[PDB]
Design a protein around this ligand. Structure first.
Ligand SMILES: *[C@@H]1O[C@H](CO)[C@@H](O)[C@H](O)[C@H]1NC(C)=O
Ligand SMILES: NC(=O)c1cccnc1
Length: 246
């Protein structure tokens, strides 16, 4: 398992937690020195548990699918909560079985459905460590509309930060003051599968993408990624979704 405490948290401790989250995910090979997530994992070993503590020391445990870094659900005291989708249904056969009751959230765990439930797009929701503290606290007591926004914060400050060093850095910059994500952050989140695929297809094509990927950079400009010498590939992306799952 991995753990992170908001009490005493700073950019250093958050960065270390994200390193630990990345390194908790199994892989058997690297592609251009980036861990390639496994095509499949059978049984309980498919799920990583992340123990998150809010500033007051109250805790939730979050179950993450190690093949894609997707959050399946979480445990708050004696109640488990799972997204309304087959992958989370499966997860609930393996994790948090000791919970006294299970609530299936009234949405699946993708951005489209979460944004509808929250009533707002990612672009308008501040993120940062204070927002993560708030998100943990919200998830402690069931409220599905509030939970949708909290889960948008949680996903971006854990899974997306693990996937992209740039997003990790954005959250570090928001350690003590929340701010909506940059355009670049949104573009990277929206392109993780596409980038993962092209980096894998570039092996066998001399590091050249079969199909270029368009992103927004940290200055807000459109850029086209065409090959693995791009900083997006050499320093930014940290985990690759297996093409078997694309
Ligand atoms: C490969 O990517 C690098 C880094 O972004 C870029 O400078 C170079 O022009 C690209 N090569 C092409 C497009 O042939
Ligand atoms: N459910 C998730 O953890 C999730 C959702 C959207 C993108 N990445 C991860």
């Amino acid at each position: 398992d991995v753990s992170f405490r908001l009490s005493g948290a700073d950019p250093r401790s958050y960065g270390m937690f994200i390193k630990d989250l990345r390194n908790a995910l199994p892989f058997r090979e690297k592609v251009y020195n980036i861990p390639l997530l496994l095509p499949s994992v059978s049984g309980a070993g498919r799920y990583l548990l992340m123990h998150l503590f809010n500033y007051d020391g109250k805790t939730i445990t979050v179950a993450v699918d190690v093949t894609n870094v997707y959050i399946m659900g979480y445990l708050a005291d004696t109640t488990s909560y799972f997204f309304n989708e087959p992958a989370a249904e499966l997860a609930s056969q393996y994790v948090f079985r000791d919970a006294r009751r299970k609530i299936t959230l009234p949405y699946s765990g993708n951005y489209e459905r979460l944004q509808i439930a929250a009533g707002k797009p990612r672009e308008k929701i501040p993120i940062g460590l204070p927002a993560l503290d708030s998100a943990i606290s919200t998830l402690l007591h069931y409220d599905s509309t509030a939970a949708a926004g909290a889960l948008l914060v949680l996903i971006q400050t854990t899974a997306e930060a693990a996937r992209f060093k740039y997003i990790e850095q954005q959250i570090q910059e928001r350690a003590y003051r929340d701010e909506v994500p940059s355009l670049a952050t949104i573009s990277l989140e929206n392109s993780w599968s596409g980038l993962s695929k092209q980096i894998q297809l570039a092996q066998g094509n001399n590091g050249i993408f079969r199909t270029p990927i368009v992103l927004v950079d940290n200055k807000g400009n459109r850029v086209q990624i065409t090959n693995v010498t791009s900083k997006v590939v050499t320093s930014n992306i940290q985990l690759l979704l297996n093409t078997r799952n694309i």
